[PDB]
Amino acid sequence: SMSYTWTGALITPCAAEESKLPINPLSNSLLRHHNMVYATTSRSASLRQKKVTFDRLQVLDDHYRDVLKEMKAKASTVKAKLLSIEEACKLTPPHSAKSKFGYGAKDVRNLSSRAVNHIRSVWEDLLEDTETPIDTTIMAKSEVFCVQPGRKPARLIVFPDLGVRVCEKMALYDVVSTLPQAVMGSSYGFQYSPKQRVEFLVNTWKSKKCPMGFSYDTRCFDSTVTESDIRVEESIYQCCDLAPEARQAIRSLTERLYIGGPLTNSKGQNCGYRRCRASGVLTTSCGNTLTCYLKATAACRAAKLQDCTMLVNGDDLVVICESAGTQEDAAALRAFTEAMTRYSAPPGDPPQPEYDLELITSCSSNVSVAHDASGKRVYYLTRDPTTPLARAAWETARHTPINSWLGNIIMYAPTLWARMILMTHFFSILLAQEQLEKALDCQIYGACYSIEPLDLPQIIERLHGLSAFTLHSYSPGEINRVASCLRKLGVPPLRTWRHRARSVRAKLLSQGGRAATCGRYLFNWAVRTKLKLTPIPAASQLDLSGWFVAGYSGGDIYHS
Ligand SMILES: O=C(Nc1cccnc1)c1cccc(Oc2ccc3c(c2)c(=O)ncn3Cc2c(F)cc(F)cc2F)c1C(F)(F)F
Ligand SMILES: [Mg+2]
Ligand SMILES: [Mg+2]
């Protein structure tokens, strides 16, 4: 079937869409070349649509079915709790899209009788109507990036009403939170923190006689998801012990929402139909991981690859296996791609076999190596800093809802670039404006979290470990990448930053409390006359488990 059908109606913006970085004093400090940073707008909607509209090709075989059973077996062990309207309401973000029925996120969290009575009807409806397609909205996602030697057309997000969204939580939250792990096990990426992802990646890499690995970029994964897939996915969920209403709920959401449905724009006009994955639903991340894993696993067997270990995060896939030689591997990978193509998951960038782990890129990042105070190697997780910086600049000169810099600092706290640039910049700013003690919302694996800036040192140590404050001697590969990015964007050089940080540090010492703590641990690198860094008392009082349990991108989740 066609992934998308269009009536001709336009994908419209429900306000004003900014596209260029403002020339501001605070931002021009971080990076000068503002004319290299852009935000996607609905103006490029049509272009995306062309790229994401086509006819799927899907042929299944024994390997696929054999793997689907292996997976269903493990799912059977699961028992998923049915959330109550009240619990589901807790999970709704405060910034979540308002309903088309007289209420928004705020009311939902407050349990407003109106918001709640409506949610009930939507539920009662799901249990009664097992066929009527459910409406969804189609918008142009606004994201910021850096120009490439054209530009990236905005991504399109499809999502149902807030009422429907709260019900999805009731029936499938516990499911999409425990099942993917019970099925894929150590291969489920969202269960790991940055430290753990690295551990798993080098531990897997070193467990092979002669390792070979590759990342696999599926071309617009969401559009390749077929009605067949969405149902196979449902069969897996159906293996869970479920409460009657939940089972009926899943059956209906599958047919009415997940496999497809009408598309309405912000103006109420009909846009077309969707016969693929809905990026903005609760089951997106879970289902994409399950589908990707299923196919890739089956593809490995079809391709005769040896001892394949998968690490899947949604549609993001990386594979480490036993090398059979340069020619044998290149032939096998090629077969793998063909098998994946028949499973309706064609490549965008033909997969290239890598023999140097640091060269493999999964979830837009890679495993690199640095050294602790003792000079002992300390493997860690990094990534090109171009996008994080473009967004950083952007977020500085524009009030953004989800500060992605806070998050980027947490996730990449031990990297060269996050420590030298991000930590420095944002703090001297927070301090200058005296915002050191303000809770800010940021994201981690799709879920929205409220974070207090000064609690960073604990968080960092608890997630990464003290070594994150003393790492040095980053590989030459890493340096050259941070070098080019900074050059390209017109970012101040190392010497400039050290001086700035050299100042922010002392700026922080003279205040004590958690503040002086930050200056002491975060900017240790700054001074040559260091300071022995010991375990932070408050580090052991942080329950960051919920932070790394499952994926929720587009799932509209908010962990209180
Ligand atoms: O800025 C540089 N080059 C440039 C700048 C502008 C235009 N074109 C090129 C530039 C110039 C020379 C070296 C360099 O890399 C660096 C910078 C600091 C380094 C290392 C390499 C290292 O191997 N080992 C330790 N440190 C010290 C260090 C650290 F352990 C942690 C930090 F939190 C900050 C910091 F200092 C850079 C880099 F892109 F910043 F990364
Ligand atoms: Mg965990
Ligand atoms: Mg892709």
Side-chain angles (χ1 to χ4, degrees):
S1 56
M2 289 303 281
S3 62
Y4 288 106
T5 275
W6 309 102
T7 69
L10 256 35
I11 297 188
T12 65
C14 59
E17 312 193 310
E18 247 64 48
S19 69
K20 293 198 74 62
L21 181 65
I23 304 175
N24 134 70
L26 290 168
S27 64
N28 187 56
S29 156
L30 181 58
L31 60 78
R32 284 54 183 277
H33 310 172
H34 49 47
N35 299 315
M36 283 187 90
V37 168
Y38 64 96
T40 52
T41 55
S42 63
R43 286 194 278 297
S44 47
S46 89
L47 299 181
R48 190 66 199 188
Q49 295 179 293
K50 190 180 189 182
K51 212 289 176 65
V52 302
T53 295
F54 54 91
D55 203 32
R56 283 63 73 65
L57 168 148
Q58 191 173 58
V59 174
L60 309 177
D61 51 49
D62 292 5
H63 288 296
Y64 176 94
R65 287 181 289 271
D66 284 343
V67 176
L68 163 51
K69 282 163 188 169
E70 277 154 43
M71 285 168 80
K72 303 184 72 164
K74 295 164 184 170
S76 303
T77 71
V78 173
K79 182 178 178 174
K81 144 162 43 61
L82 172 55
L83 262 57
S84 56
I85 303 189
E86 187 182 303
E87 310 175 68
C89 286
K90 275 204 58 197
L91 294 150
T92 305
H95 58 290
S96 181
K98 66 199 228 63
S99 179
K100 307 199 294 188
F101 301 100
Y103 71 85
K106 292 187 187 300
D107 312 300
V108 172
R109 296 182 72 60
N110 306 325
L111 304 184
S112 170
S113 63
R114 190 184 187 69
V116 160
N117 296 324
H118 180 244
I119 295 193
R120 281 172 187 303
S121 58
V122 181
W123 184 247
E124 322 282 41
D125 180 80
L126 283 182
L127 305 183
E128 311 181 13
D129 189 327
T130 71
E131 193 183 308
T132 302
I134 289 166
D135 188 55
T136 66
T137 324
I138 183 161
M139 293 285 254
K141 168 101 156 296
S142 184
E143 300 183 295
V144 164
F145 299 118
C146 165
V147 301
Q148 292 275 168
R151 297 187 183 184
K152 300 166 60 181
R155 290 223 303 279
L156 305 168
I157 66 171
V158 193
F159 58 93
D161 194 76
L162 179 58
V164 171
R165 298 209 295 278
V166 179
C167 298
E168 288 185 273
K169 293 185 173 80
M170 285 180 270
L172 291 155
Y173 181 64
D174 196 43
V175 179
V176 300
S177 295
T178 48
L179 176 103
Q181 220 260 44
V183 174
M184 303 166 252
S186 65
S187 297
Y188 184 45
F190 294 112
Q191 72 182 301
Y192 308 128
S193 63
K195 188 74 180 172
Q196 316 183 317
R197 186 187 179 75
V198 165
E199 287 182 4
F200 180 77
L201 279 170
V202 344
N203 268 31
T204 297
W205 186 267
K206 291 180 172 179
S207 76
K208 312 289 186 192
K209 302 168 174 59
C210 187
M212 183 282 265
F214 63 92
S215 60
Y216 190 81
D217 171 61
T218 306
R219 172 180 150 299
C220 291
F221 191 100
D222 283 4
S223 292
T224 65
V225 186
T226 66
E227 299 111 317
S228 187
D229 302 314
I230 310 293
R231 294 193 165 104
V232 154
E233 164 188 345
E234 187 205 344
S235 69
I236 304 193
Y237 301 146
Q238 286 287 322
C239 280
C240 303
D241 175 284
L242 301 163
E245 314 222 307
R247 194 181 285 295
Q248 189 50 269
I250 295 169
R251 180 89 277 289
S252 293
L253 292 168
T254 299
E255 289 305 318
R256 308 182 64 179
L257 176 65
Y258 305 149
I259 71 172
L263 299 170
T264 316
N265 62 36
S266 69
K267 298 316 162 191
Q269 308 169 344
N270 186 188
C271 266
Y273 205 77
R274 168 184 55 83
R275 305 200 191 62
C276 63
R277 183 74 74 194
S279 64
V281 290
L282 174 49
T283 45
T284 312
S285 186
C286 183
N288 286 332
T289 299
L290 277 181
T291 305
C292 191
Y293 175 106
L294 162 49
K295 297 181 181 174
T297 297
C300 282
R301 304 186 181 170
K304 254 70 177 179
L305 273 165
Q306 290 157 49
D307 193 51
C308 297
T309 305
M310 312 292 208
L311 178 57
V312 214
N313 300 77
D315 73 324
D316 205 286
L317 171 66
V318 52
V319 198
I320 300 172
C321 57
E322 280 293 6
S323 174
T326 292
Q327 294 300 59
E328 301 72 8
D329 282 353
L333 227 205
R334 276 194 290 262
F336 177 85
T337 318
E338 293 304 343
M340 281 291 291
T341 298
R342 302 196 292 282
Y343 293 151
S344 182
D349 314 313
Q352 284 318 312
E354 286 308 305
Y355 294 108
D356 175 39
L357 182 163
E358 175 167 1
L359 293 199
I360 292 171
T361 300
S362 62
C363 229
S364 302
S365 67
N366 66 284
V367 161
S368 197
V369 47
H371 304 71
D372 56 28
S374 322
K376 185 192 175 199
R377 298 157 65 66
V378 179
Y379 286 123
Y380 69 119
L381 195 64
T382 181
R383 66 163 292 169
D384 188 303
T386 308
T387 300
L389 281 179
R391 296 191 171 165
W394 182 281
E395 306 193 307
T396 302
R398 283 285 178 60
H399 226 185
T400 178
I402 299 70
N403 327 294
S404 58
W405 60 270
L406 173 50
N408 258 337
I409 274 172
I410 286 179
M411 301 296 280
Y412 296 107
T415 58
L416 170 53
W417 59 270
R419 301 174 59 197
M420 179 172 97
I421 304 180
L422 296 192
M423 287 182 229
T424 312
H425 183 73
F426 283 107
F427 256 113
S428 55
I429 296 179
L430 279 177
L431 185 282
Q433 309 181 304
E434 310 188 8
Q435 291 289 178
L436 289 169
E437 290 178 59
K438 189 180 186 297
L440 307 170
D441 283 312
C442 71
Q443 294 185 309
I444 296 182
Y445 292 153
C448 203
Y449 294 99
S450 195
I451 294 297
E452 305 196 3
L454 288 166
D455 280 310
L456 274 171
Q458 301 78 282
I459 298 181
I460 289 189
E461 187 202 309
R462 196 71 227 300
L463 297 190
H464 293 287
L466 303 173
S467 69
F469 306 125
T470 85
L471 277 181
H472 71 74
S473 295
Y474 296 71
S475 72
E478 181 67 14
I479 305 178
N480 192 63
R481 192 170 76 191
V482 179
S484 301
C485 170
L486 298 213
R487 199 180 303 143
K488 165 175 67 180
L489 306 183
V491 170
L494 152 59
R495 63 191 194 61
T496 312
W497 286 114
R498 171 176 52 223
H499 298 177
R500 310 215 200 184
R502 193 76 149 270
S503 179
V504 194
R505 175 166 169 295
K507 276 292 197 166
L508 285 166
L509 302 175
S510 62
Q511 267 163 283
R514 308 205 310 302
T517 304
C518 305
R520 192 174 289 87
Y521 292 77
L522 302 178
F523 307 101
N524 182 63
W525 56 277
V527 189
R528 176 203 326 286
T529 295
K530 321 288 187 177
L531 297 189
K532 288 66 166 55
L533 297 175
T534 63
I536 296 186
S540 305
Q541 77 175 184
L542 304 180
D543 184 18
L544 304 322
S545 289
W547 284 30
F548 311 104
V549 182
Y552 300 114
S553 298
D556 186 49
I557 298 303
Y558 179 76
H559 294 320
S560 181

